[PDB]
Ligand binder design. Structure first.
Ligand SMILES: [Cl-]
Ligand SMILES: [Cl-]
Ligand SMILES: [Cl-]
Ligand SMILES: [Cl-]
Ligand SMILES: [Cl-]
Ligand SMILES: [Cl-]
Ligand SMILES: [Cl-]
Ligand SMILES: [Cl-]
Ligand SMILES: [Cl-]
Ligand SMILES: [Cl-]
Ligand SMILES: [Cl-]
Ligand SMILES: [Zn+2]
Ligand SMILES: [Zn+2]
Ligand SMILES: [Zn+2]
Ligand SMILES: [Zn+2]
Ligand SMILES: [Zn+2]
Ligand SMILES: [Zn+2]
Ligand SMILES: [Zn+2]
Ligand SMILES: [Zn+2]
Ligand SMILES: [Zn+2]
Ligand SMILES: [Zn+2]
Ligand SMILES: [Zn+2]
Ligand SMILES: [Zn+2]
Ligand SMILES: [Zn+2]
Ligand SMILES: [Zn+2]
Ligand SMILES: [Zn+2]
Ligand SMILES: [Zn+2]
Lengths: 269, 270, 270, 269, 268
């Protein structure tokens, strides 16, 4: 959403400032060779490399977690069918909580209003309990645990099979903490701070130190070099907001729709 | 690939004969800045190829679980219900149908022939109705295990032992689906394959000042190295890609089918 | 940061450089950059791996604290779901769990737990806990006795007792995981052979730079020492993630979250 | 092996100093800076490649380590749960030992028949040898032992399950070894790397010679040793079930296993 | 920590190199710094990756020992919460658990466990244990039948016997993992290749540096040699985590911590 074709052509210009500036240079006692900029440029590419690595890892973890939502809810619906196929009332109740959980987890991470979706899926008295909590999504898990918890007290599930389905609720519980953790723990600011400073300074001092060698090609190369360090420093911030609505963020709404369609395929609806 | 090895050799033959009208005008290309650019690109290609490898390893691992989980499920059926061969046959069908259906799912090819060969056509049209056929095959396998439980042939404990194996497959389905809907860079593997593509053709212009008539040779050696590394990343990054090698995906569904018929003594021929 | 002493100090070492330059010719000291390129790149490579190792320690520490919140959340869920009427047990257990995480934060910060312990538990138990040389483990054992009594009371079966037992196991893994990241630091050689060689590289770098950039030398030398020394000290910050630096973990915020969570509505559930 | 390519390189370096006579007379000139670029690139790729090979080696050693652990504790549970069934003890142990040797034979593409025959009845050997996967069949037979103890009421479903889990663990080891064996990366890793490390090594002296003159062969083999030795160790580590120097001592590993399992069931090697 | 002899050899190497620089032209030897950039950078990359593998072995060792303290703690917590009356079996099992960790320590350090073993066990069992070529495994087998006895004595259900069996399984994986780290060392070719090339690089380096640094090379080259050599030997001080240096795992401390923890959880 924020772009830097601004600094690629501030480069083209601060490259042109350089060529005309050349002949008043050694006058002052100012020369700039590339060798120390090779040193720094390489030290920055190493550090850009490790950083982007962290950024990609955390994006992959965000996708893994949403992946698990689809898996655990798929299999918990399957277990309900295979263990209690008479029980379509309980089927339909548990399914609306599991769908509610995903929608509510999307809203929570986008900081939007789950109320419409919650009301689409759940009794109004259930919606009230969920929204009264300071942790609505976690309160949805508690309610689904009640559905199977009473199926247990009613003897329709044993402690064994109660256990098989509880574990899926633990899986979702790990997804929720995981998303909360990812959403409140960015890659430390120092990294992107330090890097965005040095990648910036280096990208505009570069056409200076390149002028002695390349003279009047300083722009077509000091740009090429700068774009490379910038399309690589940008791929970073394009990968550390996984839950947003931007283009390269995760399509959470589409994944929530896939989760809902999946569970309704499994229950006829 | 080798079309861009020869776009290079001629970009360099261009570079030598045109080198004459170069600093007639003041247009200098050292090799020191192009070595800072190259080392940087080579560093990023290192990390990029490192992430592709990991996607490739995870796909191989997920397919490994299919073989593992299906084998231990069938071993459990035999060990716990050694008499129930009709159930053995039915379940072994769905497991085999799951593997093939998954492979067809990932490579976006038609599963109908493999399903029609494995399953009763009532279940085949049910499976082909679902927008999630592989999931529906797992669901059907589950009803088999559940019926043995309703019938009292499986206890809740032993029903549970087999349920776990179906979970393992559930994880494999989603893992594979996640690994396919991606990439995660979007079109930034777009930008880096052209950043390499540009560098590799600007390069002989920068080298000609140092090597004259030999720059077609040293700049194609370098280009091959960079484009080989890059293209290797392209291949690893899309492990179920249409432009992939189906040998192991095919070999894997064939191994598991073979193993399973063996385990249910449908081999050898009497 | 605390860098700005040395980033300053470097500009005056880079000054001593330029007011003893042409004085080089007389004294016999040639001093090129390409050896300091080599030395610089090796230090960058080694700083790259050091910093990677430190982030891993940060990330694992953050995950361990994530699990406290997860495991404690789902343990209260199980109690609310299996023994829904047992509010005296719910509140007793919730208090130990909140005791557990505050007690852990004090343990890793080497501060006194007694305030928080008393805010939350009976003082007979506040003294049982401080009596133990391992108080967080003692809190775990107490939470296990509540779980265990409910089982001798016949309110939990063996199955449902195990279900809750496993969550206390999960927290025993957080405890040991944190003790390992605390009591096992990174080896000390890694920390100060590496920080002497980076500043030593920083205070000599201009003496070899002064020949190529003349006056420009304090600029580029300080640019380069910034890049190097900010990277090194970020590494030493994340290496100690239970510490109190600006990039360490917010352990107090995280214990409040756990607390607000388990006591969501004075502890009221549907 | 590697010292033949080292030898061919010092010869290539002599061909270089000799034919330096006719260099610009034949219209050539080769600087070092281009080869430092190419050379650092190859170093970086070799560094990552090598890292991947070591990972495979550690995973292969890991999987074998789990055979020992799982088999140890399966025997531990038989003794703790059924202290009286010494015949089950000896039959399961002979399968668990049969499993290990067969796994070795499998991964080494050799014949298990001797070892099988040493350890089991011939009616079993024939059943095992009939299988597309003998190790699978051995796991299934070990599974019958504990499964028959369960039909006899000597094992509950719970305690049958506990031991079944260990057989499940051996299944995973088998799968993982089978996956580490039938999954070499596309030779692209070897062809791109091995031939370009070869090719770079042999043209390095032609580019070193203008700078170093008679010193060419000394520095040119030092650089060539470093790269080749690095590349060649990568190739040993990536096939860890082979018979090379750095390859898992699978026979000793099997004897340690048999030694262990015989030691736990009161017998003497 | 006799890197310092290697660096003083390096100062002599550049003394020799400055002294010898005259007869360079005469003898026809040309040494630029550029091919040594290439080689040194390559060595750095490989040293970086190698050192990284060494760190990862050290960390796996510490995690393995971390699991001992965790698994033994929660086994004892389970015994107290499930069988709070049976303090006779608590003490039996705790002494088997504490025996395991001391026996593991001595096993990895190739020392005599008899002192700690007889300090904790009746000789009725200590001689059984040391008659085995796998003592620590046998201590696990012995802890196992304590649990098994309780089960067959009806005091444990299959379910609760199961719950504790899983913790013995955890200790089994620690045993296997530690043994695996001890017997399977990091491939020795790593330290050969690298000790050679790093040492040879550090001595050949002044002969390439003096062309352009003249009387300064003793300094610049001892620096570089200090960086490489000390990085390389950090990797080696990390590759044997079960050793004896203060650099290594304080296994005695960890075993004392484990003993105190399990004794404290029982009163003693
Ligand atoms: Cl699942
Ligand atoms: Cl329904
Ligand atoms: Cl499995
Ligand atoms: Cl059959
Ligand atoms: Cl059969
Ligand atoms: Cl949990
Ligand atoms: Cl195990
Ligand atoms: Cl026996
Ligand atoms: Cl545990
Ligand atoms: Cl006691
Ligand atoms: Cl006690
Ligand atoms: Zn799952
Ligand atoms: Zn239904
Ligand atoms: Zn966004
Ligand atoms: Zn059958
Ligand atoms: Zn067959
Ligand atoms: Zn959990
Ligand atoms: Zn309550
Ligand atoms: Zn000058
Ligand atoms: Zn000057
Ligand atoms: Zn295990
Ligand atoms: Zn026996
Ligand atoms: Zn499994
Ligand atoms: Zn555990
Ligand atoms: Zn006691
Ligand atoms: Zn007594
Ligand atoms: Zn002795």
């Amino acid at each position: 959403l924020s772009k830097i074709i601004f600094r690629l052509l501030l480069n083209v210009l601060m490259s042109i400032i350089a060529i005309i500036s050349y002949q008043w240079y050694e006058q002052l006692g100012i020369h700039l060779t590339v060798a120390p900029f090779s040193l720094l440029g390489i030290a920055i590419a190493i550090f850009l490399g490790f950083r982007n690595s962290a950024s990609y890892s955390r994006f992959v973890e965000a996708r893994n977690l949403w992946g698990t939502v689809l898996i655990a809810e798929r299999t918990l619906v399957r277990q309900l069918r295979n263990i209690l196929p008479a029980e379509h009332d309980a089927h339909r109740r548990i399914v609306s909580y599991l769908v509610a959980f995903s929608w509510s987890l999307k809203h929570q991470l986008r900081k939007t209003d789950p109320t419409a979706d919650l009301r689409r899926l759940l009794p109004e008295e259930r919606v009230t309990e969920i929204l009264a909590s300071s942790m609505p999504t976690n309160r949805i898990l508690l309610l689904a645990g009640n559905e199977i918890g009473q199926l247990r007290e009613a003897g329709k599930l044993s402690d064994i099979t109660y256990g098989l389905m509880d574990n899926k609720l633990d899986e979702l519980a790990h997804v929720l903490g995981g998303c909360e953790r990812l959403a409140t723990t960015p890659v430390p600011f120092a990294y992107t701070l330090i890097l965005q400073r040095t990648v910036y300074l280096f990208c505009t001092l570069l056409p200076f130190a390149l002028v002695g060698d390349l003279h009047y090609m300083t722009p077509f190369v000091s740009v090429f070099i700068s774009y490379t360090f910038l399309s690589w420093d940008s791929l970073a911030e394009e990968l550390e907001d996984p839950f947003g609505t931007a283009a390269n963020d995760l399509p959470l709404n589409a994944m929530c729709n896939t989760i809902e369609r999946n569970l309704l395929d499994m229950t006829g609806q």
